[PDB]
Design a protein around this motif. Structure first.
Motif, PDB file in Angstrom:
ATOM      1  N   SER A 142      -0.261  14.971   2.444  1.00 10.00           N
ATOM      2  CA  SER A 142      -1.550  15.493   1.905  1.00 10.00           C
ATOM      3  C   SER A 142      -2.724  15.180   2.850  1.00 10.00           C
ATOM      4  O   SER A 142      -3.322  14.092   2.703  1.00 10.00           O
ATOM      5  CB  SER A 142      -1.806  14.946   0.520  1.00 10.00           C
ATOM      6  N   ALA A 155       3.387   2.292  -3.330  1.00  9.45           N
ATOM      7  CA  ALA A 155       2.759   2.985  -4.480  1.00  9.45           C
ATOM      8  C   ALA A 155       2.560   4.476  -4.178  1.00  9.45           C
ATOM      9  O   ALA A 155       3.045   5.303  -4.973  1.00  9.45           O
ATOM     10  CB  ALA A 155       1.444   2.328  -4.822  1.00  9.45           C
ATOM     11  N   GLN A 156       1.877   4.794  -3.072  1.00 10.14           N
ATOM     12  CA  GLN A 156       1.251   6.121  -2.808  1.00 10.14           C
ATOM     13  C   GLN A 156       2.297   7.244  -2.781  1.00 10.14           C
ATOM     14  O   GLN A 156       2.281   8.073  -3.712  1.00 10.14           O
ATOM     15  CB  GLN A 156       0.436   6.090  -1.513  1.00 10.14           C
ATOM     16  N   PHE A 157       3.164   7.276  -1.762  1.00 15.34           N
ATOM     17  CA  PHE A 157       3.925   8.485  -1.341  1.00 15.34           C
ATOM     18  C   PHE A 157       5.257   8.593  -2.096  1.00 15.34           C
ATOM     19  O   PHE A 157       6.179   7.788  -1.845  1.00 15.34           O
ATOM     20  CB  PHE A 157       4.067   8.489   0.182  1.00 15.34           C
ATOM     21  N   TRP A 213       4.136   5.580   6.761  1.00 14.08           N
ATOM     22  CA  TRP A 213       3.460   4.252   6.711  1.00 14.08           C
ATOM     23  C   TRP A 213       4.453   3.102   6.951  1.00 14.08           C
ATOM     24  O   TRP A 213       3.982   1.991   7.266  1.00 14.08           O
ATOM     25  CB  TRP A 213       2.709   4.069   5.384  1.00 14.08           C
ATOM     26  N   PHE A 219       0.499  10.230   6.807  1.00 15.27           N
ATOM     27  CA  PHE A 219       0.611  10.156   5.326  1.00 15.27           C
ATOM     28  C   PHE A 219       1.944  10.777   4.885  1.00 15.27           C
ATOM     29  O   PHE A 219       2.009  12.015   4.778  1.00 15.27           O
ATOM     30  CB  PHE A 219      -0.532  10.925   4.657  1.00 15.27           C
ATOM     31  N   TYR A 268       0.867  -1.213   0.000  1.00 15.28           N
ATOM     32  CA  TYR A 268       0.000   0.000   0.000  1.00 15.28           C
ATOM     33  C   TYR A 268       0.892   1.247   0.000  1.00 15.28           C
ATOM     34  O   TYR A 268       0.626   2.178  -0.787  1.00 15.28           O
ATOM     35  CB  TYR A 268      -0.958   0.014   1.197  1.00 15.28           C
TER      36      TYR A 268
END
Ligand code: DGD
Ligand code: CLA
Ligand code: CLA
Ligand code: CLA
Ligand code: CLA
Ligand code: CLA
Ligand code: CLA
Ligand code: CLA
Ligand code: BCR
Ligand code: BCR
Ligand code: SF4
Ligand code: SF4
Ligand code: SF4
Lengths: 107, 91, 150, 80, 61, 728, 141, 39
Positions: free
Chosen positions: B45, B38-40, B67, B62, B35
């Motif tokens: 944000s 990918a995101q940060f 994470w 975040f 998870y």
């Protein structure tokens, strides 16, 4: 116990005759599952004549309802006001229709 | 869960249920590490302010280094936290 | 005979299919008096069913190892099975089709044709109905004349 | 985004502009047609491709065409 | 252009009335490209009985 | 900048759709970014290698597990009374009695029965031990690695071939006809002569000694001498026992006809001569197109010469060289068409003339195979007709094909479509009409009133082939016919003996129940071809949508306006066409299954009498032969038919999901999702998680495919479970 | 002529609905509508709900431009009013949209040159073999 | 009754007054000539 309820006969053509099955009482036909025979016993009906007379009455009532429907559109159509008398409609339907209905039935 | 409903519920019933709770932990850790993978890419944000409306400092919930320590927390918490439902019900 | 299959007039199975069906109805008819209503039906069906078998034996159809009459569809032992009927259809279908053709064209030139597809000009149709009796003689002559195709 | 084009068969009856839900089309002066006006699509990045414009066109064949193309957040009707 | 009310065949291949007949309503005497306004008895899919055509996309027959 | 690497447009998609399309767009080369003809051909070539490597690895896998987990050696010794093992099973989900249940054969654990006919294949070819299987498994694995190698090899700039090379059609035709067809069948025939034939005669010939063993006593003397008849001097006796010395002859090439009586398969001598004969025709014929020598034909010149006088075919075939050599989809259409025909060809010849020893004794295997190749053939056909229209859209040059057979084809396409429509409506009305007629007569207890047409025409053909039942006395039936007198001392004694053994499948007996079902199949054919052909010819333009070719092969619609345009694209045409594929081969496979099931059961009178009406199919086929299947488990206990019945229901469940995606469409589901995406975003704790890819409803075209897929899978799996469980 | 200034004015009466804004307004582009309602009369919320308009300047907040042009056409047809409306970005910038050139797009206004306007009949398009080996489509020629 | 007859000559009415005719005809012929598989 030993007769199957039947109120339909087929005409003899095109092999359809076979549909007239062994249903009892010396009669050849289609076994009904509408449950009319029991209604009739519950209503106290004993002879066919009575069923005939009930039938003719329903036909007259059909004529009267058809008449009624033409009438209340073509001769005397009620006004919006009329249809909006909800309190009166509710009272009359509760007390006359259901009430006097089950009362007279109970008679 | 994996003690009383399992295949060896009618018997190794709690050894059976023990490391199976230790598992959905380690998969969550894959799920939460993947998870995160990918995101940060660049900076956080979040809704920056409070109900009062003043610009409070943004949370590390975040972020790139965020994470990771959660995904670590979900592991060390999970694996150890699993052991104490079968040091108390078993041992 | 043709495809080695037996004729219904002779074949055993076919004549044993007679027996079974009849002897199904005679096991029913026992359960009723002779004067009764359904007894006249279970006698009349039998009479008809026994007549029916007799009238394929006289027709001379080919019955197989099954006991059932099979059909012949090319040439002349068994013309009437298919070869004659076949024309029957192509006629009456051609009749219907050509009447329908002569109707739609007969309307076509009349300002709004779509009304005549719904409120059908009955006395137009019933004149085309009879005219459509001699249709192959017209259909041919129209293919000749060269008004048949767009 | 989706591609929207107007061809020269346009009469400029303006139904396609007036029908659009996302204001993609506009009317411009021209010299080709009896109405002295033609339709144009300068805002196709906001085009959703719902094809009301096409349904509204009276010309035969239609003088607006919508070619569904590469899809972006706006063209996919997203509010989330 | 064609005379008003004359029976004309369409020759624009992308039309709903292609190789079909229509009647001329009025040919606009201007610098317009599709001046020949034709009306037909049968509608297209888009509920339209009438369209505009150029001088090379009509033939009076 | 993100995957899809090959599409900027899709890569910039903010949603989950990007993903789906990405998977869906993967093999469509022409639609990728910055593509050229070179990259197209080269990627296609590499992809072909890739396919081949997967095939060889797959085949090696089968051999591997038969050798490692099977009872190959127990089978050879006793083929009649041993159930061939496919594979072992290690399922940790199984219960105690399950493990007992699935232990069939001589297995030391749970095992599955092979219904592929690979046993009889192998066994008939010469395969004798596990060792052989292992060596073959290694080899073919080596060929797989070699093919993979080769794929990456001609990817480098030094080994990258030029487009001109790809367009050298004459050379590829010459080489494939002479080498791939000719040489490889010659070499097989070599294998049959050197290994298979001796193996059937009970002399085990291996890599270590073949060179030292004479297949014929006076070998290679006849060959050069022109005394070829010596190779057919003494065939195997009628009491020969397969794989044993007893009754074995010495001949290597014969024209005997019929079957090897104990195995009931074709004679390996006949097979040898067959492969050899075709090999010669291929080899001679493969020297026909011009290359680098000056001798040979021009394709272009042949095609352009063939234009009949008085322009009854317009410009004939002028311009087809270019439009074929340019168009890849055309080649794939021709290929798939031919391949589909020959797939059913294989299916229909293999069952009636089985080639393998102790096949056809294996009911389940035969049924499994024949269903297999007919469904494969169906899909392949729909695909042929699917790259039909892709041509019509993307590839066709209207100017370059002016007034040719192709353009003229487009010209009168309404005639073609409308006459297919006639032919399908005719069949649909009459066949259904005669069945339902047949049912009503059955219902009223008067089966004598049935309309049963006897198939006189096929019964005639069977007579011309020599079956004597019908007593027409034509050609190979009549003893006073030149056709009879010519080959009576060649192979006809083996033939005529086999055709008239009605316990075998060769030209089964035919009656009115055969008559109806073939016209049902004809309905199948004509209607599916109606959808596919209509879809192909109107791929470019129609009156509703003249500019369709601007959009391409798959599009949802063209809006709700001017009536509504759902399922307008040729894509959707093929989609609709798949359902008829499925239905039609559904009918054909049923036809097949039953007419055999009643043969094996010993009462062909069941079929002849119940196939004439549809209840008969319902009651006597479906209701009867699922009895054991549905019993695989009950509240009382279990048996070995667990997996099939599980999979039966699995298939049904897949089948009904498909209905979901087919019937209900997007707008409902998206708004569903629309509320869900609000729901998530104001759910605390869960708030702290958010998606990267915006959740969106699957497309129309997506829904279209996903329905179809579920439908087909469910179809296939359900039947397969039924077919196998019933036949077994 | 000048596009609209972007001031603070009070939104009309509303108890609130679930149909409104979400994460998209925070990290993507939300939308703002402006008009001068004469009297206080009710309107249909395009994202569901009853809502009373106020006199003087009223502004609303939406996350899609359909929700504007559904409302605007509901404000323009029913009440016979005239609203302007424009975008917003999450760093504090604005994009003036409608009416772009003061005049609404249906009736003609000078200074709006034609875009994506093909100058032939559609059947006078080339066949899609003549647009391979590119990144181009079938209409732009 | 110009109006009443136009209604009686409407599509759904004609169809029904036509089908009861060509139905009867086929039931009728199956009575006096029962059970045909020839002629
Ligand atoms: C293995 C297991 C499966 C794992 C993954 C697949 C599951 C998901 C598939 C659903 C997605 C289908 C889809 O994306 O939906 C849409 C797709 C793609 O549509 C395309 O969508 C495109 C999207 O455009 C965007 O993208 C383009 C570039 O890609 C450009 O950028 C373009 O400008 C931009 O607009 C274009 O609009 C194209 O015109 C349009 O064709 O549809 C299609 O073509 C479908 C793709 C071609 C499929 C080939 C035919 C398959 C037929 C199978 C028959 C059944 C077989 C079963 C056999 C069973 C035997 C046991
Ligand atoms: C919501 C449906 C449902 C329910 C209530 C249960 C309940 C149960 N299942 Mg499960 N199971 C389900 C669906 C369900 N199953 C499905 C869909 C499958 C796939 C086929 C399985 C396959 C499965 C297996 C293989 C096993 C269980 C087992 C179990 C038990 C232990 C599971 C646990 O503690 O975690 C429990 C009684 C276990 C047991 O011991 O029983 C076990 O061995 N289940
Ligand atoms: C006056 C009545 C009339 C006539 C003479 C014809 C004549 C014809 N129709 Mg039919 N047709 C009719 C009414 C009529 N149609 C109606 C009312 C319908 C709608 C139910 C159809 C629907 C229809 C279809 C769907 C098809 C025909 C077709 C045909 C042709 C072949 C015969 C056939 O299959 O039927 C033939 C020229 C077939 C064809 O074109 O060939 C064909 O595919 N027709
Ligand atoms: C490409 C064809 C093919 C296919 C379809 C399968 C399929 C299978 N193999 Mg595999 N296998 C193959 C080739 C193949 N194998 C080859 C070429 C080798 C090397 C010689 C192996 C060696 C192998 C082993 C060692 C095992 C499997 C096993 C299995 C089963 C479980 C899946 C797995 O382990 O992966 C499954 C039936 C497992 C099994 O039988 O359980 C197992 O233990 N396979
Ligand atoms: C005798 C020579 C020879 C042989 C044995 C083969 C054999 C083969 N070729 Mg061919 N090929 C040949 C000459 C030959 N080729 C020549 C000279 C050319 C260039 C003119 C080609 C160009 C060619 C192409 C372009 C392709 C093949 C492909 C194939 C394979 C087809 C698939 C299959 O298994 O069947 C097959 C292995 C296909 C393949 O699978 O790769 C393929 O894509 N061949
Ligand atoms: C490509 C396949 C192949 C290969 C590699 C071989 C190889 C060989 N064959 Mg041949 N053979 C083949 C196909 C093949 N055969 C076929 C298709 C047939 C059927 C006509 C035969 C029939 C045959 C016979 C009858 C004999 C050979 C023999 C031979 C050997 C000598 C040939 C010579 O010198 O001339 C040689 C090892 C000779 C031998 O001694 O073995 C021999 O007697 N072969
Ligand atoms: C040799 C076999 C072969 C080959 C190489 C191809 C190759 C291709 N097919 Mg496929 N196709 C095949 C057989 C084949 N097809 C078969 C058997 C069928 C029937 C099930 C189809 C039905 C089919 C359709 C309906 C479509 C493709 C499409 C495609 C393209 C994209 C597929 C994708 O990305 O997923 C690609 C060029 C797609 C395309 O872009 O065209 C497409 O829409 N194919
Ligand atoms: C049991 C279901 C069923 C039935 C009875 C029919 C019946 C028919 N379909 Mg079929 N059809 C079906 C399912 C069915 N369809 C399904 C599920 C699809 C996929 C959407 C189609 C798609 C389809 C197409 C595309 C065509 C037919 C056509 C026809 C007609 C073929 C001629 C004939 O036999 O008479 C006929 C009315 C053909 C026709 O009308 O001619 C034709 O072209 N059908
Ligand atoms: C004899 C016989 C047979 C055979 C047959 C055949 C082989 C046939 C063929 C046929 C053909 C080969 C045909 C063709 C045709 C063509 C065409 C071209 C057509 C046309 C048509 C039309 C044109 C029509 C018209 C019309 C009319 C007339 C009326 C109604 C309306 C309409 C309009 C529809 C069989 C064995 C089966 C059976 C027995 C007998
Ligand atoms: C299908 C199958 C398989 C496979 C197969 C394969 C793929 C094979 C291949 C291949 C092969 C196995 C081959 C072989 C070959 C051989 C040869 C080829 C030899 C030769 C020798 C010699 C000695 C010769 C010589 C000569 C002369 C003398 C003269 C002329 C020239 C020459 C050189 C020819 C398996 C079993 C796994 C499984 C089952 C089935
Ligand atoms: S609708 Fe067709 S015609 Fe009316 S304006 Fe838009 S484009 Fe010009
Ligand atoms: S498609 Fe729907 S949105 Fe895109 S332009 Fe035509 S109308 Fe406006
Ligand atoms: S497909 Fe869905 S959207 Fe396209 S037209 Fe048919 S319905 Fe309207």
């Amino acid at each position: 116990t030993h007769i199957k309820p039947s109120a339909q006969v087929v005409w003899p053509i095109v092999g359809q005759e076979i549909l007239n099955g062994d249903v009892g009482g010396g009669f050849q036909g289609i076994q009904i599952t509408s449950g009319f025979f029991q209604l009739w016993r519950a209503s106290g009906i004993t002879s066919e004549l009575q069923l005939y007379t009930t039938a003719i009455g329903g036909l007259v009532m059909a004529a009267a309802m058809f008449f009624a429907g033409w009438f209340h559109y073509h001769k005397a159509a009620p006004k919006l006001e009329w249809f909006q008398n909800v309190e009166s409609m509710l009272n009359h339907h509760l007390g006359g229709l259901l009430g006097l209905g089950s009362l007279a039935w109970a008679g | 869960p994996f003690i009383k409903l399992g295949p060896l519920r009618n018997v190794t019933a709690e050894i059976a249920g023990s490391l199976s709770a230790a598992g959905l932990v380690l998969i969550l850790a894959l799920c939460l590490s993947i998870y995160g993978s990918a995101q940060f890419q660049s900076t956080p944000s979040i809704g920056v302010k409070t109900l009062s409306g003043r610009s409070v400092a943004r949370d590390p919930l975040f972020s790139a280094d965020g994470w990771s320590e959660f995904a670590a927390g979900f592991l060390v918490g999970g694996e150890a936290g699993v052991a104490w439902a079968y040091v108390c019900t078993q041992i | 005979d043709i495809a080695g299959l037996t004729p219904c007039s002779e074949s055993k199975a076919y004549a044993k299919l007679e027996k079974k069906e009849l002897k199904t109805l005679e096991k029913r008819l026992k359960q009723y008096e002779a004067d009764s209503a359904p007894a006249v039906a279970l006698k009349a069906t039998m009479e008809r069913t026994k007549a029916r078998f007799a009238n394929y034996a006289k027709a001379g159809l080919l019955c197989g190892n099954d006991g059932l009459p099979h059909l012949i569809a090319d040439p002349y032992g068994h013309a009437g099975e298919v070869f004659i009927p076949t024309f029957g259809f192509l006629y009456v279908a051609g009749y219907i089709g050509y009447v329908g053709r002569q109707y739609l064209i007969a309307v076509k030139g009349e300002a709004k044709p779509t009304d005549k597809e719904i409120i059908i000009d009955v006395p137009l149709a019933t004149k085309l109905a009879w005219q459509g009796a001699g249709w192959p003689l017209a259909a041919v002559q129209e293919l000749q004349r060269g008004t048949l195709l767009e | 985004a989706h591609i929207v084009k107007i061809y020269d068969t346009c009469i400029g009856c303006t139904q396609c502009v007036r029908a659009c839900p996302l204001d993609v089309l506009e009317m411009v002066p021209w010299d080709g047609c009896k109405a002295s006006q033609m339709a144009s699509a300068p805002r196709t990045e906001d085009c959703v491709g719902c094809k009301r414009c096409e349904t509204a066109c009276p010309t035969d064949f239609l003088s607006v065409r919508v070619y569904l193309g590469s899809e972006s957040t706006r063209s996919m009707g997203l509010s989330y | 252009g064609p005379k008003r009310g004359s029976l004309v065949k369409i020759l624009r291949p992308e039309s709903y009335w292609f190789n079909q007949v229509g009647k001329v309503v009025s040919v606009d005497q201007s610098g317009v490209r599709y001046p020949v306004v034709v009306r037909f008895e049968n509608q297209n899919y888009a509920g339209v009985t009438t369209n505009n055509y150029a001088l090379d996309e009509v033939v009076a027959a | 900048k993100l995957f899809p690497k090959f599409s900027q447009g899709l890569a910039q998609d903010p949603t989950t759709r990007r993903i789906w399309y990405g998977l869906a767009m993967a093999h469509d080369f022409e639609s990728h970014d910055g593509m050229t003809e070179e990259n197209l051909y080269q990627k296609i070539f590499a992809s072909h290698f890739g396919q081949l490597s997967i095939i060889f690895l797959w085949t090696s896998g089968n051999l591997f597990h038969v050798a490692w987990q099977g009872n190959f050696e127990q089978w050879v010794t006793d083929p009649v009374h041993i159930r061939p093992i496919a594979h072992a099973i290690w399922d940790p989900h199984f219960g105690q009695p399950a493990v007992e249940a699935f232990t069939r054969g001589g297995a030391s654990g749970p095992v599955n029965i092979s219904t592929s006919g690979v046993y009889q294949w192998w066994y008939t070819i010469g395969m004798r031990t596990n060792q052989d299987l292992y060596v073959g498994s290694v080899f073919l694995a080596l060929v797989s690695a070699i093919f993979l190698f080769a794929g990456w090899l001609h990817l480098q700039p030094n080994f990258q071939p030029s487009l001109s090379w790809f367009k050298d059609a004459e050379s590829r035709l010459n080489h494939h006809l002479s080498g791939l067809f000719g040489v490889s069948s010659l070499a097989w025939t070599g294998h049959l002569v050197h290994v298979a034939i001796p193996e059937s005669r009970g002399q085990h010939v291996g890599w270590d000694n073949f060179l030292s063993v004479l297949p014929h006593p006076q070998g290679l003397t006849p060959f050069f001498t022109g005394n070829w008849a010596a190779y057919a001097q003494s065939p195997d006796t009628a009491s020969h026992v397969f794989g044993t010395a007893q009754g074995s002859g010495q001949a290597i090439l014969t024209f005997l006809g019929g079957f090897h009586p104990q195995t009931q398969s074709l004679w390996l001598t006949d097979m040898a001569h067959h492969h050899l004969a075709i090999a010669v025709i291929f080899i001679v014929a493969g020297h026909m197109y011009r290359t680098n020598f000056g001798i040979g034909h021009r394709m272009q010149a042949i095609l352009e010469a063939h234009t009949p006088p008085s322009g009854s075919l317009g410009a004939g075939h002028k311009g087809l060289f270019d439009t074929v050599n340019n168009s890849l989809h055309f080649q794939l259409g021709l290929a798939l068409a031919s391949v589909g025909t020959i797939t059913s060809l294989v299916a229909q010849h293999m069952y009636s003339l089985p080639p393998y020893a102790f096949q056809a004794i294996d009911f389940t295997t035969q049924a499994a195979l024949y269903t297999h190749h007919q469904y494969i053939a169906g899909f392949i056909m729909c695909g042929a007709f699917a790259h039909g229209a892709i041509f019509f859209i993307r590839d066709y040059d209207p100017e370059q094909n002016k007034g040719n057979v192709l353009a003229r084809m487009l010209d009168h396409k309404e005639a073609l479509i409308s006459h297919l429509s006639w032919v399908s409506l005719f069949l649909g009305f009459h066949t259904l009409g005669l069945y339902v007629h047949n049912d009503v007569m059955q219902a009223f207890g008067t089966p004598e009133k049935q309309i049963l047409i006897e198939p006189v025409f096929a019964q005639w053909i069977q007579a011309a082939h020599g079956k004597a039942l019908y007593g027409f006395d034509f050609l190979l039936s009549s003893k006073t016919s030149a056709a009879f007198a010519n080959g009576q001392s060649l192979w006809l004694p083996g033939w005529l003996d086999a055709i008239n053994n009605n316990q075998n499948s060769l030209f089964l007996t035919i009656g009115p129940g055969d008559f109806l079902v073939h016209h049902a199949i004809a309905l199948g054919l004509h209607t599916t071809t109606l959808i596919l052909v209509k879809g192909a010819l109107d791929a470019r333009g129609s009156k509703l949508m003249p500019d369709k070719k601007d959009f391409g092969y798959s599009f949802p619609c063209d809006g709700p306006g001017r009536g509504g345009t759902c399922d307008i694209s040729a894509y959707d045409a093929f989609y609709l066409a798949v359902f008829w594929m499925l239905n039609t081969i559904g009918w054909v496979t049923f036809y097949w299954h039953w007419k055999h099931l009643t043969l094996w059961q010993g009462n062909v009178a069941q079929f002849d009498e119940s196939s004439t009406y549809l209840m008969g199919w319902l009651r006597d086929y479906l209701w009867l032969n699922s009895s054991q299947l549905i019993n695989g488990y009950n509240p009382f206990g279990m048996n070995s038919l667990s997996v099939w019945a599980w999979t039966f229901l699995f298939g049904h469940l897949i089948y009904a999901t498909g209905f979901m995606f087919l019937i209900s469409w997007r707008g409902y589901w998206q708004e569903l999702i629309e509320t869900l995406v609000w729901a998530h975003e104001k759910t605390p704790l869960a708030n702290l998680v958010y998606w990267k890819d915006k959740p969106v409803a699957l497309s129309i075209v997506q829904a279209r495919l996903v329905g179809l897929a579920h439908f087909s899978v469910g179809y296939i799996f359900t039947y397969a479970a039924f077919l196998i469980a019933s036949t077994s | 002529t000048v596009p609209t200034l972007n001031p603070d004015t009070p939104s009309p009466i509303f108890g609130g609905s679930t149909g409104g804004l979400l994460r998209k307004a925070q990290t993507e582009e939300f939308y703002v509508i402006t008009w001068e309602a004469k009297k206080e009369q009710i309107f249909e919320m395009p994202t569901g709900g009853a809502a009373i308009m106020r006199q003087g300047p009223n502004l609303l907040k939406f996350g899609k431009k359909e929700q504007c042009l559904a409302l605007t056409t509901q404000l323009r047809n029913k009440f016979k009013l005239t609203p302007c409306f424009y975008r917003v970005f999450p760093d504090g910038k604005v994009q003036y949209l409608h009416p772009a050139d003061g005049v609404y797009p249906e009736k003609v206004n000078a200074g709006r040159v034609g875009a994506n306007q093909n100058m032939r009949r559609i059947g006078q398009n080339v066949n899609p073999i003549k647009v391979k080996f590119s990144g181009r489509m079938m209409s732009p020629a | 009754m110009k109006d009443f007859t136009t209604y009686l000559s409407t599509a759904p009415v004609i169809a029904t007054i036509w089908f009861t005719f060509t139905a009867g005809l086929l039931i009728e012929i199956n009575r006096y000539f029962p059970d045909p598989l020839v002629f």
